[PDB]
Amino acid sequence: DYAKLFEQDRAHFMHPSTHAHDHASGALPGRIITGASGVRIRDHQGRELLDAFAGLYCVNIGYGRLEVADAIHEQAKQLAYYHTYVGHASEAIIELSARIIRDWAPAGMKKVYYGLSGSDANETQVKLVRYYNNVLGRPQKKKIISRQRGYHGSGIVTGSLTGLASFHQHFDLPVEGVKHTLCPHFYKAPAGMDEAAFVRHCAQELENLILAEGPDTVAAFIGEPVMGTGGIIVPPKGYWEAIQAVLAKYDVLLIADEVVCAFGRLGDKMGSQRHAMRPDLITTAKGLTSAYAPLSAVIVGEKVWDVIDSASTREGAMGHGWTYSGHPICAAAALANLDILERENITANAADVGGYLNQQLRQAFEGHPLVGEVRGDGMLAALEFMADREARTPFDAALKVGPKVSAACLERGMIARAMPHGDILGFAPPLVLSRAEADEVVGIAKAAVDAVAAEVL
Amino acid sequence: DYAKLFEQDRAHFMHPSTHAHDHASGALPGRIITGASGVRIRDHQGRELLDAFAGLYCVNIGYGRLEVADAIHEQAKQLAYYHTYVGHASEAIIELSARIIRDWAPAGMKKVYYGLSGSDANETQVKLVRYYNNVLGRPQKKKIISRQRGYHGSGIVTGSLTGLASFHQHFDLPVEGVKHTLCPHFYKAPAGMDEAAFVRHCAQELENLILAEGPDTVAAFIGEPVMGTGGIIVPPKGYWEAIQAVLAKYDVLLIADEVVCAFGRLGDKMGSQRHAMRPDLITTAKGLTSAYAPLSAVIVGEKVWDVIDSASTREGAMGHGWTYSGHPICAAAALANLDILERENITANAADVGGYLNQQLRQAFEGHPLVGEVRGDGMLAALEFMADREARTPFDAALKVGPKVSAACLERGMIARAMPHGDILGFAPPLVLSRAEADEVVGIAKAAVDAVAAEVL
Numbered sequence: 086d087y088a089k090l091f092e093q094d095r096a097h098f099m100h101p102s103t104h105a106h107d108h109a110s111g112a113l114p115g116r117i118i119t120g121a122s123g124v125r126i127r128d129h130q131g132r133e134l135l136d137a138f139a140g141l142y143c144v145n146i147g148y149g150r151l152e153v154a155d156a157i158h159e160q161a162k163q164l165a166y167y168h169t170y171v172g173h174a175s176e177a178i179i180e181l182s183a184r185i186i187r188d189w190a191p192a193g194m195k196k197v198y199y200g201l202s203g204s205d206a207n208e209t210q211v212k213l214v215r216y217y218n219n220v221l222g223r224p225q226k227k228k229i230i231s232r233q234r235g236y237h238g239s240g241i242v243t244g245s246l247t248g249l250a251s252f253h254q255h256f257d258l259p260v261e262g263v264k265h266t267l268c269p270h271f272y273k274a275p276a277g278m279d280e281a282a283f284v285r286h287c288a289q290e291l292e293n294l295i296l297a298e299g300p301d302t303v304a305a306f307i308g309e310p311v312m313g314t315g316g317i318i319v320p321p322k323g324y325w326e327a328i329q330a331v332l333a334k335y336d337v338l339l340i341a342d343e344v345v346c347a348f349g350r351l352g353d354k355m356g357s358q359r360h361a362m363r364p365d366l367i368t369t370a371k372g373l374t375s376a377y378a379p380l381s382a383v384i385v386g387e388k389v390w391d392v393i394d395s396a397s398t399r400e401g402a403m404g405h406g407w408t409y410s411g412h413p414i415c416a417a418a419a420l421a422n423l424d425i426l427e428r429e430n431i432t433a434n435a436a437d438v439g440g441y442l443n444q445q446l447r448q449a450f451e452g453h454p455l456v457g458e459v460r461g462d463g464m465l466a467a468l469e470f471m472a473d474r475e476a477r478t479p480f481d482a483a484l485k486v487g488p489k490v491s492a493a494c495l496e497r498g499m500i501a502r503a504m505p506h507g508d509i510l511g512f513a514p515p516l517v518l519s520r521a522e523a524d525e526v527v528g529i530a531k532a533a534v535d536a537v538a539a540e541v542l
Numbered sequence: 543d544y545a546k547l548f549e550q551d552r553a554h555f556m557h558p559s560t561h562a563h564d565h566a567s568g569a570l571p572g573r574i575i576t577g578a579s580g581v582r583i584r585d586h587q588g589r590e591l592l593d594a595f596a597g598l599y600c601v602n603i604g605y606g607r608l609e610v611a612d613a614i615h616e617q618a619k620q621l622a623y624y625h626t627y628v629g630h631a632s633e634a635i636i637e638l639s640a641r642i643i644r645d646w647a648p649a650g651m652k653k654v655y656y657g658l659s660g661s662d663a664n665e666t667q668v669k670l671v672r673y674y675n676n677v678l679g680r681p682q683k684k685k686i687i688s689r690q691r692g693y694h695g696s697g698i699v700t701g702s703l704t705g706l707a708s709f710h711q712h713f714d715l716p717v718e719g720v721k722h723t724l725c726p727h728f729y730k731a732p733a734g735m736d737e738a739a740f741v742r743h744c745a746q747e748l749e750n751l752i753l754a755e756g757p758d759t760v761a762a763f764i765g766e767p768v769m770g771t772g773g774i775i776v777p778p779k780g781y782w783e784a785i786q787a788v789l790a791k792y793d794v795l796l797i798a799d800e801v802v803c804a805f806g807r808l809g810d811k812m813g814s815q816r817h818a819m820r821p822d823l824i825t826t827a828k829g830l831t832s833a834y835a836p837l838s839a840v841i842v843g844e845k846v847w848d849v850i851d852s853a854s855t856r857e858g859a860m861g862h863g864w865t866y867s868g869h870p871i872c873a874a875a876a877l878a879n880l881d882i883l884e885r886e887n888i889t890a891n892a893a894d895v896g897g898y899l900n901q902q903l904r905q906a907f908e909g910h911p912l913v914g915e916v917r918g919d920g921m922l923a924a925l926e927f928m929a930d931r932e933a934r935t936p937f938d939a940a941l942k943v944g945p946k947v948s949a950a951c952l953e954r955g956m957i958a959r960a961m962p963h964g965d966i967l968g969f970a971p972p973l974v975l976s977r978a979e980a981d982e983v984v985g986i987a988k989a990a991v992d993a994v995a996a997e998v999l
């Protein structure tokens with residue numbers, strides 16, 4: 086890539102999550118990715134970067150997969166697009182639906198509805214929750230409960246579910262009818278609480294919110310098995326059962342937001358099987374295709390599906406569709422993705438190498454004076470940098486310790502993201518990462534963290 | 543296609559806009575499209591159908607385009623995906639942004655933000671409208687005004703903008719802060735009003751709504767140049783200027799929803815140039831890629847962009863992104879699409895053959911006893927069937943005249959959609975349609991309408 090392209094970028098391309106002015110003026114320099122293979126990408130300067138974030142928790146089978154590119158091409162040649170309205174389909178979308186339900190989804194899942202992004206999938210979730218209760222004659226039972234630091238999308242309603250302020254700022258979010266309970270981050274639990282007591286606290290807090298709101302008004306609770314963008318927050322021991330006990334008591338649906346965790350990410354089929362969650366609805370995307378083509382999928386459980394089915398006899402077809410729902414080339418990409426996941430036992434690899442990565446991180450970083458917590462689960466991990474480790478005092482956000490450490494990794498040839506609203510270095514590498522590659526990742530992160538500690542301590 | 547596939551479809555595939563139970567039980571039969579070429583698709587029975595709806599107003603360059611399939615394949619091989627966050631880009635997305643602004647968008651457009659569906663693009667629009675007013679210190683100026691029969695998406699907020707009840711039913715829509723003004727359908731204007739007086743009426747009605755709500759609370763107005771899913775409602779003479787005069791008077795932004803009308807559909811670059819609209823923000827999708835890959839694009843005018851740019855100096859990066867924003871394969875598909883549109887002068891073809899189609903429809907259907915109105919603009923057209931043509935009395939909706947006529951076309955080998963909330967046969971054929979093909983379309987529609995008139999009159 087090329088200096089004219091960068092002029093045209095600054096003039097006309099509005100990027101996601103990009104400082105509008107600094108990009109436009111060149112102060113935030115652009116970067117063009119020209120190719121990629123395995124766990125590495127190549128920029129316009131010829132730099133090859135080790136990408137320990139797999140794009141955005143999404144390039145799970147690794148880059149450069151000619152198999153998937155050929156599967157997309159064959160579908161694009163045969164039939165790039167027709168709609169899936171009024172019972173229309175491609176072979177590919179039918180096959181994909183059966184394979185998701187049969188090979189990947191938890192017990193009791195039935196139907197799959199397709200979109201393009203995780204955000205449109207959670208938008209679909211909110212509609213299904215309202216529909217379900219309206220057709221069952223419970224018009225007041227509508228509120229959705231999310232969590233502080235949850236990430237669930239970047240729309241109005243989906244941004245409201247999101248529990249990170251940057252997705253609310255100047256958008257007047259959260260909307261009415263979305264409430265937030267605690268982030269279950271045990272490291273930051275009230276002083277004196279052991280893990281069990283903190284879980285007990287989290288459950289009581291949720292219960293009190295349901296009771297304050299009126300249980301007859303509360304429809305669903307949404308949660309990622311492990312919180313991703315909110316900073317790699319692993320649920321404490323017994324958390325999910327404690328939460329599900331509260332929800333069951335007041336007939337609240339569970340939406341498992343599996344956009345990160347599904348399709349081998351935590352070393353399991355999805356996060357729900359790993360973390361003892363029994364969701365009524367599931368959101369997926371990212372790893373569904375390994376980002377080779379855009380696709381999202383809402384997985385509907387038998388209970389909600391049966392009400393949708395029976396209600397349709399009275400109500401006609403549900404008023405829901407996106408033009409590109411079931412897009413054939415996106416289904417073809419997904420099937421090639423699932424083929425590779427299965428054939429190369431990548432889920433088992435993510436368990437093993439993810440266990441290893443987390444271990445090697447603890448070894449390199451536990452007791453490091455800049456690091457307050459090392460954490461993770463499967464092929465997700467994080468370091469959270471703190472000012473006083475034992476008192477759990479963070480740095481002031483303006484010191485930008487997290488962004489600095491991310492930047493220092495990038496100088497040293499590795500991509501690891503500085504997470505929002507804190508000083509946190511996140512890792513979400515391709516699920517095909519080797520143990521050797523994991524050690525490379527830890528080695529570079531360690532050099533980066535050491536560099537920044539020198540500057541800031 | 544195949545009987546096992548249909549079993550798996552009924553068991554596991556939740557379709558957009560599909561009677562859940564009747565599909566699942568087989569009463570609503572499924573159909574698998576196995577290929578397509580030109581203006582025709584092929585189903586699992588070998589039937590070749592003339593598709594006068596171009597999928598969903600979207601397959602604009604026609605089916606079977608190996609050029610686009612190869613362009614997708616070449617990008618999928620080189621770099622299927624990386625993100626476009628924090629100033630990252632592909633060559634393709636940069637080129638696309640410059641070409642949209644330079645060759646297709648109206649005067650005064652600057653930046654392009656990418657999504658996957660028209661609905662996520664209007665979701666982005668609502669965020670930009672709220673941001674704009676919040677950063678300008680106008681926290682009350684937030685309400686959006688749409689229109690009865692407008693179609694703007696199938697989410698919560700985007701469904702609220704939509705002015706068709708089927709997208710509201712059991713979803714508790716429209717949300718607060720979305721209001722609807724009149725559908726400007728001159729055929730159904732209050733008795734006694736000539737066209738000029740009706741336009742005058744529509745403007746006063748909008749003004750009264752702004753005044754009732756408080757102009758300081760009203761942020762934007764959204765409208766399709768010609769209303770698509772709402773039934774091919776062409777704006778009356780002087781309508782758009784009358785509306786823009788009201789909006790300008792109270793500093794209300796104009797969002798042009800060009801998801802149907804953009805990229806040659808009305809025989810012009812976009813509907814805005816054709817219909818004297820000067821929008822602050824523009825929504826696009828469908829014809830942006832001719833559906834070869836999913837993509838949406840929000841086109842931001844200089845006025846709104848300049849506030850976003852300057853606000854970022856104080857506020858940091860805007861909290862907005864979708865993981866697949868700028869998806870490379872989708873950009874590659876778009877560029878091949880635009881290449882073909884330009885190279886084959888398809889916009890000029892849409893003007894000519896669309897003019898012809900509308901003329902031939904008027905000839906075949908004006909005075910037909912089942913038909914209350916023939917209407918259209920460019921390569922969009924509709925027949926609206928009525929019980930009393932002069933008194934403008936419709937059939938009762940339960941007679942399903944529209945669906946019947948659609949079904950009768952389909953028996954005769956042609957796809958033309960029965961539009962929601964009325965008895966309306968819609969046409970939106972590929973922009974590459976020939977005059978001969980247009981005459982085929984009119985001929986089959988005429989036989990279909992005659993058949994249904996025999997049954998119902």
Ligand SMILES: *Cc1c(COP(=O)(O)O)cnc(C)c1O
Nearest residue numbers: 202203204236237238344864865
């Ligand atoms: C990325 C993400 C989403 C939203 O997905 P998009 O494709 O960016 O809309 C939703 N939930 C979780 C947990 C995510 O990580």
Ligand SMILES: *Cc1c(COP(=O)(O)O)cnc(C)c1O
Nearest residue numbers: 407408659660661693694695801
């Ligand atoms: C189809 C359509 C949309 C929504 O597009 P999706 O891709 O289906 O979300 C929005 N506005 C108009 C005018 C449309 O025709």
Ligand SMILES: [Cl-]
Nearest residue numbers: 430431432433
């Ligand atoms: Cl495995």
Ligand SMILES: [Cl-]
Nearest residue numbers: 887888889890
């Ligand atoms: Cl032309």
